[PDB]
Amino acid sequence: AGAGGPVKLSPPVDKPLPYNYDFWMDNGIYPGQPIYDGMFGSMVGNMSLEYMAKGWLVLLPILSAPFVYEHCIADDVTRNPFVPRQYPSEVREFLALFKNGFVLNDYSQPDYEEMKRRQSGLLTPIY
Amino acid sequence: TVMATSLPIVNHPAFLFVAGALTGFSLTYAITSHYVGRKEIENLVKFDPRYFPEYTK
Amino acid sequence: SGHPNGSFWSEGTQVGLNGFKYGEIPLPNGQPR
Amino acid sequence: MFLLAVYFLFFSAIANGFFGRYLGVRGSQLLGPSALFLALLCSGTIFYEVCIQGCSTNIKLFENFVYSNELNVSASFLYDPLAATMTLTVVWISCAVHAYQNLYMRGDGSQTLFTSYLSAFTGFMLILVAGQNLVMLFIGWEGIGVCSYLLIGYYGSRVSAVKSANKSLIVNKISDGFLLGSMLYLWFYTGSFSYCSLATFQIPDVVSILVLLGAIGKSSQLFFHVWLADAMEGPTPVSALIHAATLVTAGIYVLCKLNLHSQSAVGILGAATALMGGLFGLAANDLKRVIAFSTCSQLGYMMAVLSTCDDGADFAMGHLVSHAGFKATLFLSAGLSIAKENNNFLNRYGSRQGSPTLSFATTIASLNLLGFPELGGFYSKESILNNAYINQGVSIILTLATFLTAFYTSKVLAQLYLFPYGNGRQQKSFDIDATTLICFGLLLSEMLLRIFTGSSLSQNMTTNLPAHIKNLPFWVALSGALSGLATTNLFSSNFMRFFGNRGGFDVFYARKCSNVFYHNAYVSYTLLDRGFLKLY
Amino acid sequence: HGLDRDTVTERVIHVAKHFEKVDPNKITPTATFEELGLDSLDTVELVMALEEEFGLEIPDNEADKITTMADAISYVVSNPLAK
Amino acid sequence: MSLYLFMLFLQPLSLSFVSRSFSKISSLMMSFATLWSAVYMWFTSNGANQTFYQVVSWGSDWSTFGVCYTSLYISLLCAFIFPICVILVQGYRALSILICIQTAVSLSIVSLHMLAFYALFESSLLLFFILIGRRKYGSLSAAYNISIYTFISALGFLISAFWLNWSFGSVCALLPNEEANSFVAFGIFILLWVKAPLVPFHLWLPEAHVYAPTAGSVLLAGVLLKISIVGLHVFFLPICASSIVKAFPLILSICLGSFIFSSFSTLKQIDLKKIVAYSSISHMAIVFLSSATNSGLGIQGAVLYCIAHGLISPGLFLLVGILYKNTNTKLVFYLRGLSQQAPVWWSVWVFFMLGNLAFPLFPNFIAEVVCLSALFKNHELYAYAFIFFSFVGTVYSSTVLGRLKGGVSSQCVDASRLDVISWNPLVLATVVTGIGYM
Amino acid sequence: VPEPPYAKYLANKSHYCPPDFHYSREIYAPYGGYFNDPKGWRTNTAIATLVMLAGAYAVFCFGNAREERLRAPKGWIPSQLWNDNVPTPVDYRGKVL
Amino acid sequence: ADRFPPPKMVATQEEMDNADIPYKYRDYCAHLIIDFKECRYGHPLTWRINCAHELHHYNKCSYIEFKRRVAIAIEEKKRRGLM
Amino acid sequence: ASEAVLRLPHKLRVMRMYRTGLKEIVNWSYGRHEFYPRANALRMEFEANKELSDREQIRKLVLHGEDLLARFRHWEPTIRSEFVGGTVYGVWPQHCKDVKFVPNPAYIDEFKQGDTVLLY
């Protein structure tokens, strides 16, 4: 039965309240909770922050291993066995404008250097 | 016994071995695939006489 | 459970005021407030 | 004609939420679904006109919504091919959920207010999708945020539910702050808020980072995914809408509408989110939480595909619209299962006589999730996986994510149907009316139509890949499914515990960020203004 | 729903039978677990099995106070969530 | 203009001749008639007259009164919100005090003479000292705080006005004068620094709001905080622009610090009126900084956001006063289950709290967009700083709403017919401005 | 406790209301009571539907007046039946229809 | 690049605009994608069965273009001495 | 082990360990079928050391079992919905009687409602 279920009422305060009792959220039902669960009190699974940090320390190298190879170790010539899509000159010139384009990696092109410098563009507006 | 009444084959040793072999092959192939597939995509063209006569003999 | 008469298109089971709007009690004889 | 659907949804919201005393519980149970059915006809007309027949329309309701000096914005609706597709998907899912809530929410006090929230919730999604300028999108964005706040915290006497709503509100606030920054950047250097003049071929990185940070909020990506799991406190109809279409998809829609994203960031973030979501869904024991983590993983796939190719935006949208269907079906069937068993934990579910329609809908939605061949989800997911081969790092992580997805999907199916009965010997029952059957029929019709009509124009376009590379995702999914059926152990107890805690993102916030926040508050108030600067 | 004593007695007696050591006539509506032949670790299992039978969660401190057939029936009768 | 001034002078005049049992009715009629006179002033104000819509003088430089864009908006806002204050307040003493306060404040807005502005604005110094320090429900400490803060800031402003009158020969706004002196610029600035609550001179506002009556709080939040922007646009920016541009990094430092620390101080509040009062302080900083940019966007955005605040914060204060009448408590921890117990009050409370969080369908959204655009015109980082730390407001607003929303309560505390009549105009105005009729 | 006199004016518990669930019947909420089902609900729903369709007609007029198609559709679209500002369709090749 | 010259562009600018072909699709295959697009949107739900010849032709030309891309890659790589 | 568990007597402490262990078997299982063999295994694990009389060894076993039960606490306890920590606990709590409702509020001294400024 969704409606009308019995509930336990939280006991009324009977002792001097701590100054930071606003960290406790109590609506009158018995299981009151911290303002943010895990800030204090019982920990889910009895796992501290140190345990989670050690687990992440174990995971990150394995997760980052696929990404680091292509992004850093690999180079445009050796990343893929083919060149980017070849377009007619009118289409290619427009597509090369996009900083987030995919034709900027065409090392066959004679404008490769300028295209690469376009890809690594400005961090912030100059004006 | 995982599912005795419905699907008892899962408890069979042969099913466990086939499933584990598939897991290993699929997962390790996922990593080695990149080198492999890039090699076949290069070899398709390099040994095609029309595109590259020199490499073919 | 179900619908009150077994038909969805049956007259509502609730007669009276669902609540007191602004907390005011309806007058007995229908006298305007 | 194009305006009519938003009118129908907002009329349903106003009627049920302000005059529901006169209408009644039955009155909502008619006016809601009827209005959304009419909106579904209007959305179908829009989809045929714009997508199939290539006829975009602009409706300007009124001009000078904000007119201060040069800053000028107008309330206008542009139905472009993206907008029509999202509108159709959203209205279809929302009509289904409104049919669902007639029987599910009958045991809830405020069914009229729930229907009103659901209808305004859909209306704000359509405002976001069809806006012609950035300000209308922001209006819809904040509307869906507030509607999620009022729907997750529907059970106010539960501390967990209201805290979940507060979590959603705060995280979404940070995200739209970043979006508002990007909006101001784009107005300043392009001259307008409209998407037509919004186009920039080269954009400075700050704008891209701000756009991405804003998008990762609603489309819950890593470091911003905390709210999605807690969003389970709300009623089941809310979860279906938020996870299927309205909230999660909005970030992807924004990233596709404006192609200011950077390939390097999106691919890494998406692949990381997909892997982490699958790993988290492995540990979960609530039925509803596993499906949310699966939603996270699918969002990771969609975000990753943007980096791959020029068609990545189309592929992401196709997976978006395909995903809405079977995910909504999965939530609705899970909610019916909870009602029938009075339980939320996967251990105590089991084989029991039931409706053939619901079990079939669950099976087909889970098959679409897994990647079962010749299905709508299969095509939209292979379009991503096969085209991600060029990005070696992304492709590997997505393939492992496919394995994990298959494993927990098959585990959930075995635990719900194949496993022996696990609940107690008590009278528990939820009899389903014809309205719920019409709901699941609508979802199944969406799924079936997706196969015939497709998701993207380049869905069946060839990716010139070797056969063993192209058919690899199927083998990984099959291996994951077979391992899931056997219910084997994949990770050690330490890593299983780590995944059960969802990576400890929330515990870090608790112990460091929240404590620093309230120590800053302590310094600001107690030490300074009620301390140093207060007289004796 | 307040469940009547007679049904609760029948179901607690039904649960108590499944221990092999306990002889089917020794279990009475008023009998302590010791006379039945149950150990402390057995009483744990019986309290848990009562938890499945009536679909309730016994908070642990009350679980310690259950040592007899009688008081278990009393506790189940007291509970308004007992099914 | 002349009709508006005459009616402003007529309202305190009527109280002397009324029967003392008809005082409430006569005061309400006078307030509505002043509102209608303000509408007439708007009607007779032609936009063709770009500099000043209307100027009237009654025989001296001090008696020079005029309306501009800022003055007209603020005067219409005060005339709009006064009747709600009138109905909320009972007794001839209270009516007299509130009528005199409103007459002085409304005459200050349209004044064009710095010395007359000072004379009218500070005439309401004892009236708040008596009002906030009333017998049973008032606190003497808060009255002392507000009175002393106002006296020191206004005396500095007066000294600057004396120097301008000595050097130029005039202190009227209509006569173009420019000064580069920093002492006079600071003398004018300190009043704005105190009146618009800006850290660290914001301590008076909280104590005043909590211990003022609901009508008093409504007036204080609605228009007395806005008097700072009338002074800034009318008496500081025309003459003291060189100093605001010289000190802009310092101005930004103080404004953004006020925003951040007021937001953090709001988090430590357990009293509803204090929560609203601290939200006001955080809201004032954006207005002050947007005006200080001295750009077309900034001035318009600041006056718009002042109108939005003067429609949203009076509503929150009114709702809190109604709840305190029903419950005799303002502590959030005592108040629970208000959603179930007061659905009609809860709906309006949530609506106004959404307005205070600047959600799109509210005027605060449009106003904030314009102000942030002005800040972005100055620099990107300026807007980014304000946009991020807006999340702190969400935390405390959400915590308050969650604490009030649910729980166990044995009291039906919902508003009566009088209360709903009290907020209906504010809700209608909020909606109308939110859809773009700013 | 003897029910107060005004309890007669208050309405009963609806059929959908669970028998165990107790709510205060005096509280007024615009969205309705705890389980509603008022008498005369059918007529209210009919009136609501009439208002919905009338507003739909007004919105349809407004949208048709403000619906601007600046590019010709590729094929025939349903809007041609009701709006006359649709440009004549041109197909992918370029031929006018 | 020079060794493997671009093919002739059958589709012209006015035809691509008339078919509303995005610039990304204008890759020496545009005529075939015009055919596939017109047939796909001609058959909204049977295009998978009906529209198979056009898709086949597009995929064939795309395969040839992909082979050209790989040939260009090999030529450039051998020119740089990497192989 | 918590303070409340420590303050318990030996008999009740071992009983608590058995109860918590059984509940954690339920939580870590995938179905009821896994439960029975694991429950029998826990049964045998406790029965193996029941006849020990050396206090120091018994203290070692109790402490080690308490550490093991602390580490294997499940992130997600399987709790019935209607009980504390359950989904349906407090969804629509039954509202109690004796509610303080003020009838016709606006018509109690309608003209003179408001705040007054009292002075000396």
Ligand SMILES: CCCCCCCCCCCCCCCCCC(=O)O[C@@H](COC(=O)CCCCCCCCCCCCCCC)COP(=O)(O)OCC[N+](C)(C)C
């Ligand atoms: C965009 C153009 C069209 C605009 C239409 C907007 C859609 C409807 C707008 C109606 C007015 C919006 C503001 C309504 C008042 C805000 C309060 C509210 O919405 O709900 C109230 C009460 O609701 C009402 O009485 C009135 C609601 C009527 C319809 C509301 C639709 C949803 C609001 C839309 C969100 C506003 C958008 C603002 C940001 C863009 C409180 O609800 P809860 O806190 O959840 O508690 C209820 C009790 N229970 C615990 C059981 C859940």
Ligand SMILES: CCCCCCCCCCCCCCCCCC(=O)O[C@@H](COC(=O)CCCCCCCCCCCCCCC)COP(=O)(O)OCC[N+](C)(C)C
């Ligand atoms: C207790 C409350 C119970 C009663 C509830 C009342 C329900 C209210 C219904 C919601 C109304 C939604 C209408 C929103 C449109 C705003 C209406 C409007 O602004 O009128 C416009 C005319 O425009 C319209 O009529 C719009 C047509 C409305 C119907 C269109 C379809 C309805 C779907 C709703 C989608 C609206 C999203 C707009 C988001 C901003 C005025 O035209 P102008 O002369 O140009 O005015 C100048 C512009 N400005 C206001 C900014 C100064």
Ligand SMILES: CCCCCCCCCCCCCCCCCCCC(=O)O[C@H](COC(=O)CCCCCCCCCCCCCC)COP(=O)(O)OCCN
């Ligand atoms: C896939 C993309 C990446 C996903 C997220 C990866 C996050 C990786 C960050 C963790 C890995 C490096 C951790 C730093 C090394 C610390 C190792 C020992 C931990 C330790 O001794 O102290 C801890 C400090 O917390 C800490 O260690 C907090 C440092 C965390 C840096 C902030 C990065 C955001 C982390 C968010 C998720 C990570 C959750 C787990 C960290 C516990 O402190 P204590 O409570 O015992 O102190 C006592 C209270 N007086």
Ligand SMILES: CCCCCCCCCCCCCCCCCCCC(=O)O[C@H](COC(=O)CCCCCCCCCCCCCC)COP(=O)(O)OCCN
């Ligand atoms: C060439 C000259 C060199 C410099 C020489 C400087 C010498 C000192 C100059 C200080 C002048 C400032 C005057 C304000 C004094 C503070 C208020 C007095 C404190 C006080 O106890 O007042 C009580 C309440 O006041 C309150 O509650 C008010 C709280 C504090 C008011 C805040 C001060 C105003 C803002 C300060 C700066 C503003 C901008 C400055 C440009 C009432 O006391 P009582 O009536 O019961 O009498 C009983 C006697 N114990």
Ligand SMILES: CCCCCCCCCCCCCCCCCCCC(=O)O[C@H](COC(=O)CCCCCCCCCCCCCC)COP(=O)(O)OCCN
């Ligand atoms: C420490 C941070 C500063 C706090 C202020 C924060 C922001 C306030 C800015 C308000 C904007 C307009 C105000 C004009 C200038 C006020 C203060 C500006 C900063 C300042 O003190 O500059 C000084 C010059 O101003 C002066 O010489 C006069 C300073 C103000 C006098 C203080 C009291 C005056 C009261 C007069 C009452 C009215 C009198 C009217 C006749 C010295 O800077 P510098 O140029 O010498 O550079 C030497 C550095 N190496």
Ligand SMILES: CCCCCCCCCCCC(=O)SCCNC(=O)CCNC(=O)[C@H](O)C(C)(C)COP(=O)(O)O
């Ligand atoms: C999910 C993973 C689950 C984790 C499981 C880990 C649990 C660890 C289990 C192993 C720890 C132990 O053996 S803890 C065993 C501690 N050993 C003793 O206490 C010896 C003295 N025994 C007695 O006094 C009684 O026989 C008594 C047994 C109290 C009963 O009383 P009854 O005679 O009246 O039945």
